[PDB]
Each structure stands twice: as structure tokens, then as C-alpha cells.
Amino acid sequence: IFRDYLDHIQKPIYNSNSITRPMFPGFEAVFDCKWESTGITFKEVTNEDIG
Amino acid sequence: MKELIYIEEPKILFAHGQKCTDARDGLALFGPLNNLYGIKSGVIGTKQGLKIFRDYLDHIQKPIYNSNSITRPMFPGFEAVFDCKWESTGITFKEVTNEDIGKFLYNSSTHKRTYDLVSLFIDKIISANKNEDENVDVWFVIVPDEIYKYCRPNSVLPKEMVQTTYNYDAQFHDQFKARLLKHTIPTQIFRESTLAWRDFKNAFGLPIRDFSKIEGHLAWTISTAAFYKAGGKPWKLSDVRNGVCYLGLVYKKVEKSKNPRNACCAAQMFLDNGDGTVFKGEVGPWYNPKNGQYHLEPKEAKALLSQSLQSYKEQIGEYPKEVFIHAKTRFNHQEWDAFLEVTPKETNLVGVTISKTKPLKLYKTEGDYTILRGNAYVVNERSAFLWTVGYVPKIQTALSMEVPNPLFIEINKGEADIKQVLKDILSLTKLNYNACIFADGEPVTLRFADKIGEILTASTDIKTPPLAFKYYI
Amino acid sequence: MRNKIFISHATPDDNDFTRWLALKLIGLGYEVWCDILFLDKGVDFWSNIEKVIREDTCKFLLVSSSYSNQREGVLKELAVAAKVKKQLKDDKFIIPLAIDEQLSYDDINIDIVRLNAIDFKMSWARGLKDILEAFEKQKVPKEVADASKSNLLYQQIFLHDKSVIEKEEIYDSNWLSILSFPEELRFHEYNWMLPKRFDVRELTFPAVRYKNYLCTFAWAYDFTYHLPKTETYHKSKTIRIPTEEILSGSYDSNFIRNAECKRLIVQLLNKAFELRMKDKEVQEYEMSNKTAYWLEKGKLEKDKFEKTMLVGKQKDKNWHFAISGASKLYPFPVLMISSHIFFTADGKKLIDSSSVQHSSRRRQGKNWWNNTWRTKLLAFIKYLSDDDTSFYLEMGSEEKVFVSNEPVKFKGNVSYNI
RNA sequence: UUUUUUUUUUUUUUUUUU
DNA sequence: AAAAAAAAAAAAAAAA
Ligand SMILES: Nc1ncnc2c1ncn2[C@@H]1O[C@H](COP(=O)(O)OP(=O)(O)OC[C@H]2O[C@H](O)[C@H](O)[C@@H]2O)[C@@H](O)[C@H]1O
Incomplete structure (x- = not known):
């Protein structure tokens, strides 16, 4: 998710x-920065442990 | 008249899943x-x-x-080699006034002045980390050269320039990088001479550290070090086998406490689920009393081997099948007995000793060049001479400068395939992230382990040290 | 004129390899056309493709993979390439490239089945090099451009110019093999005949005190001068052991262990070799652990044995070559020889400043390669030699070991050239 | 401490013998 | 107070 x-x-x-709440034009469009779904450092937490 | 066998040069992995033996050239073209x-x-x-x-x-x-260029390849530029952006804009800069650095430096006590200099920079680094919004990937510390003359042991501050902590090492580098472990700040120290040396000149008028022909490798190794410290992976091995954990143990002396207490340090290298190579530290330093033992007590051996084994289980899940333990000192029986107890049944524990002191010097019959690196003479199924230092044709010169001395490898404990053992250390000679060289004279396990030993004996108040090498090298 | 190289490829997947190849070729001074990097946006793309292939494409490159084999666009531009090939009369106009390990040569497209394909599957460096031979041999136009980055990268591609070659080569170590030993190592029961508070280092011939016994390779009564009481010693008290068995390792008991009886041979050899230097009248410098031996200035005829110069001058500092010997028996019965350089102020008195000696040694050794160390070591060995093939180390009046004057030779199956 | 390597210095330890 | 066979910590220089 x-x-x-x-x-x-x-x-x-x-x-x-749109006139009330302006649309969001894209993360790189607004902040001129690279932040993609590739390269996320993931740390797993199993469901049994939180259970 | 004896036969010596040659073992194939290892190739290290790069971007796009392709392999290359050379590292600088490989990252120069492949990324x-x-x-x-x-x-x-x-x-x-x-x-x-x-x-x-x-x-x-x-x-x-x-x-x-x-x-x-045959001896030393072309440098295409940081952005060209690493496809990463790192310019002069965005540098979070912290002030160190010349008067302030002068007040502490001109101190009679070398230890006191060293501690003061370390604290002055470290407190500012901690403040920059904690009380500012800017995020800094790596912190370059630059220091003047008079500091470099007068901030290590056996440095006699000149009498005409004297103006005016003992539980700390008088080496600035070790103390600085030791007290910063609690905050996990990637740091790398510069000498101003290591910088644009042309300003620094000697009596003869030439720069004292003339790097006119070797600016390239200076950039090569500084850029590679910066890339590694920021969280990048320059290269990766290709011949690593599944289920093999290595460990490299080294012993270091501590001057703070009575008796050296012989702190031990280890560095791991093993494969992970997939192809990701896990090359971290194994830092639980187990202090070994007595002046000159270098053999470690059973309980610490059990703890070290276990902490290594869960360091494999938490990432791969199952028991290793073969462990190849490397170290500079020989292994006696009692520590191996403790090791075996922790070692599970299917796991094959191998204890290999490594030494450079053996006086073997193979002079080829003719030619102003040394033996080719990779040549190995097998004394017997247990012991061999492997020329990890020598000539490699690609770099046009020898990795040695005088006549090289081969590496003495003995399988002290376990059984091990000696040819396979030789086939693994020469691969470990390639993983030198701190220096952008073709190969290193000693395996990286016993080298980064030596470094982490040298860094942790500077401060005695370290608790649960980081196992990431970026905080150490 | 035609001075463009077109790289056809499957756009959805193969963009990475094509971008890399295009960047490499542009860096190499070759003009390159491809959709990803050189296609003009907002233009008739098929018409531009036709124009560039028919008119300016001097060379055609197809990236063939599991995708590109059945892609429609690559098929159309491939057919246009075949047509312009027929127009130009150039069989080398097109070079397909094999990228996928999974794409066997059996299932590749027919018009490139007929064509030979340059392999990229195993390495992207050999394939690019093969493109390089293909382009110079067919004389593909290349703008020199920067002329420095271009040729530097061209050399950097070929990592290939100097590789391991299978050629036999012999290697001469720094080890001298021990040709022979005395028949037995003797364990005399001197006891009270040998004074307890006495030093065996000044004795004529090597001998070590173990337990209450004297261990040596000499005869029982060879030490009468320093031990006058020993004139009445009984030879039936000798504990001779078959030395060859000790070398094999067969002999082991309560009296002596294999571990220590080999430590009792290397010490005797060490003392014998020390006495051998003393006999040859060579001078001594105390190293941290060992003591090295060098030759004076003028002792040799014009200070050079054989054809190599062994004593020389830089400014005031007179340099002398020296060798140190160490006896070990683990690999073979061996005396290893290590080389050292020492410096003097007048050729006779060694400089007492250790820092000066270390700096001087560094300055001299700054420019000595293999043939400056090996020849000098062998010349010193020849000088210490007693005959053409060996010398003798003496431990007794009639017992000696023959040490060959030639180093232990190895063989290498791989070699190289300058 | 950008590194690497080859040396030069000490010091120490173990196993045995008196 | 030795020996040999192993140990580390430091300094100097020149190479990549
Ligand atoms: N307005 C457009 N209409 C169609 N395709 C477009 C458009 N804009 C971009 N594209 C992209 O154009 C691409 C159409 O490629 P394809 O036929 O699917 O598969 P191939 O492997 O045989 O294409 C290989 C050649 O065709 C190419 O044109 C190039 O000239 C190639 O040299 C799609 O990725 C579209 O996203």
C-alpha cells in the first residue's frame, strides 16, 4: 500500500x-526532487511479532 | 625444482549484472x-x-x-563514474576559527591537546546533526598541517612555540572517529596536504607531496570513499558461494588500562538471499587479558561465534554449511573447542591462519619485473604460498614495488580444500572500499578488522558499537 | 554523406543497453542515431527513420533479444535496412547484436540468421571491442573530436591489451637447499666436564646445551681447547641418533621430541653459518633480531665480485650490500637469504643514526628492480661459495653440510611481456 | 589520516633446559 | 640471560 x-x-x-483545494501536480513537479519507489530501504516486521 | 599452480583472477560485479576484474575501470564504464x-x-x-x-x-x-594511462586509467569524473550528483552547492559548512584551534594546539601535554582538538570538532558535528534541519550524508573533516605535525604520539611540540584526557589515544584520527560512534555520523578526515597540494611548498620549491602524476588515483580513491560512506555500493564479488560466512579476526593493544588487554575485532562477509553481498563488521570486542596471549578465552569465543551466527540467521534464516575463519595469529586448541561447541552439526568450521613473515622471494630468471600475482605454490594439503602481492598484467606494473613476499596460508583447523581456500582470499583482496586500487596485498577481512580494532582502542567508553563500515573507514 | 550509426532495438525494454552503447560510441567520436536519444520530438518519426536509414545511415546495428526478435518496428526498420543494403552493395552494413542468454542462435530471425552476430551475451566489453574492430576494418567514419577523451576511452576499452598468457617460465628463489647433513647428530654427556657457568657461543664449533647433554654435529673431543677437562671423556656415552630419521620425523621419544629436535638443528645451522661469516672475514651490522653481514670497501677487487658492483658511493654515503641467513626445515632443508643495504661515512664505520640509515636505504632502493636484487644476491652466494656448485658449513672437524650456490628453482606455467 | 607496499627499529609471548 | 619462532606499534619513504 x-x-x-x-x-x-x-x-x-x-x-x-480545483479552485478550493489546488490539485497536486506531481512530487518532482513541485519539489524538483527525485524520490521514487525504487531504492526504498525496507525493514520487515512480521505479523506474528506485532501480534 | 617445484611446481606452482596459478589461480584465476577474480572478477567483481558491477551495474547491469555484468562482471569485471578491474574495479576502477569497471566502475568507470559500467557504473x-x-x-x-x-x-x-x-x-x-x-x-x-x-x-x-x-x-x-x-x-x-x-x-x-x-x-x-596503462599504469593508471583515465578518470572520467565523479558524476560520470557514479552517475550521482555531488557539487560545491549544498555544503553545510561549520566554522573552526584559527585562534580557537591555536589555543588548544599550543599545549604542552600531547594527550590533552589531542583530546581538546577532538572535542572541539566533535561537539560542533553533534550540534550540526541535532539542532539543524539540514541533513548531511557524510561529514568531511579537514584539518591544517601543523595539527598533522603535532597531534599524535611521539610528537614533540617545539619549545619556542609551546604556549600552555590520558584515558584517550593521542592519535587524532582514531580518537575522533571513535567518540562519534554513538551518533552514527559518516565521517572522513582530510589533511590539507591531501588537498590541493600545490599551495604547500618545500625548501627546494617543489610541493612537498608532489602528486603531479598521481592526481588521478587521488581523485579515484577519495570519490570511491565518499560514495561508500554515503551508502553506495561500488562493486560486488561474483564468485561468492552460498552458505559461506568468513569472519576475519585481529588483536590490538590498548595502552589505557594496565596490561594491553588485547581487544579483538572481527569483520564478516557472506551471501544473502538473492545476490546481495553482506559485508559488515563483527564488532563485539572481546578483551583478552595478559600481555602477549593473542589466544582468546572460551566464553568470549562462544559469544563471538554465536553473535556471528545469529548475524547470519536474521538475514538468511538457516545454519551456515561451511565457515572459513581467517586471522593473523595461529589458533590453539582450547578456543577451537569452544568454537566447535557453538558450531552446529552441519556447519563445517575452518580455521585458517595468514602470515606475511615467511621469507620467500621468487626472483624470475630475467626481466626488470616481478612474478605475476596469482601464482600459488602448494607446500601440502594444509599449507601453501599464494602470491596475493605481485605483478598483474592489466595495471602494467606490479602491485609490489620491490620484490614481493607471498602470503603463507595454513588451514590450522578443519579440513578445507586448500585450492578452494586460495580461491577465496584472493577474491577478498578485491573488496577494498577505502581505496580505489586494483587489488590489496592482504584480504579485506583482516584489513577492515585491523581498522576497526585501531579505531575502538582509542575510546574505552564505547557501548554496542555500530557494525557498519562507513562509520569506521 | 553517410556518417551515422543507427541502433534498432525494442524500445519498451532494451532502452538501458542502447543508451549505454550510444553514450559510449558518442564518447568514442562516432556519430550515433537512436530514437531514445537523438529522435526529434513532435516530428514524423517513421518518415525520419526512413530518411536516416536510406540517406545517412552508414552502418546499421540491431540489438537482438527475446523481445526484439518479434517486435514489429524493428522488423520494418530491418527490412528497410536490407533494402538499403541491396542498394549500397555492402554486406557488412548490418551487424546484429545478441543480448539475451535465452535467445539461442536457433530461434533468431532469418535475415540475421544468415548474418554473423557479434556476441554481447557474456560481456558488454568484448562485444563493444568487437564493434570497434568491425568499424575500423570496414572503415566507419569517426570524428576525432576532443582527441584526448576519445583515444583515452578507446585505450581504456582494451583491460584486454595485457592478459595472462600460457608460457613456461622458471623462477629463482632466495632459498639455498641443503645438499647433505652429517650422518648423526651427537648428544654427548659432558656433564661436569663442561663448566656449568660457561657460554657455548664462543665455542669453536656449534653446540647447544639441552638438559645435561651437549648437542652438536662435531666429534666428542673437538672441543678440547676451550674444555680441557674433556680430554678424558668416554665416547660410549654418545647418544647418536640417525639424523635422516629426524628429517623424516620417524624418531620421537621421551629423550627428545620431534618438535624440539628440529629446533635443535636450525640453531646449530644458524651458529655454523654465523661462524662461516666470521671465517670469511665479513663485517656485521646488528639488525633488530638478526645480525646482517656486509663487505668492506676495497676488500673485493675494485669492490665488485663477478660482474656486479657490490660497494658504491652516493655523495658522502658509502653503500654496502648485505645478506642475512635463516635456517628452516619445514618446506625443505633450507637456508633462506634476505638482502639488505647499509650505509657508512668512510666505507668502514656504519652510521649510527638509524633514521639516516633507513632514509638512505630508501633513497638507494628507489630504483632497483628484480635484476638488481637477484644478481647481487647470487654474486654474494658465489663469493661465499667454496667451489663451483656449493660451499660447506662446518660443525665439526670432519662433519659438514654442503649448501648449493644456486637458488631453489620453481616453474611458472603463466608469464607475460613488457 | 587518499592509499598501497617494501623496509627499519624496539618490545613481547610461548614451549622447553639449567 | 640466553635461544628460535611468533607478536604488535611506530617512523620513513615512494609507489599507485
Ligand atoms: N504517439 C505514439 N504512437 C505510438 N507509439 C508511440 C507514440 N509516442 C510514443 N510512442 C512510443 O513508440 C513506441 C512504439 O514502439 P512499439 O511498436 O510499441 O514496439 P517496437 O519494439 O516494435 O518499436 C521499435 C521501434 O518503434 C519505435 O517508434 C521506435 O521508432 C523503435 O525503433 C512505444 O513505446 C510507444 O510508447
């Missing part, structure tokens, strides 16, 4: 009403 | 394994030091040409 959300925010997203 | 999108640089120092750093960085952004 984190990867999916990062993929969504890679692309522009639109609010229901 | 590193992982992408460090940008390198956020932090520099602490004075005014006349930061300018030279900026000038050197600007120099190394552009390509630098070497005199004899």
Missing part, C-alpha cells in the same frame, strides 16, 4: 474542486 | 550497483581550508588526466 501510494503521488492527482 | 541520487556534503573547518576543498571538488568534477 505504501508503494501504491507513492506511485499515485508520482503522478498528478486532482481534488474534487 | 555502480545502486543509485545515490544526491550526496549531501557537510564540511567543518576554517576559511583557508574550505576554499581548497571547493577548488579540489571543482577540479574533480572535470576529468583529470594521468601521465601514463
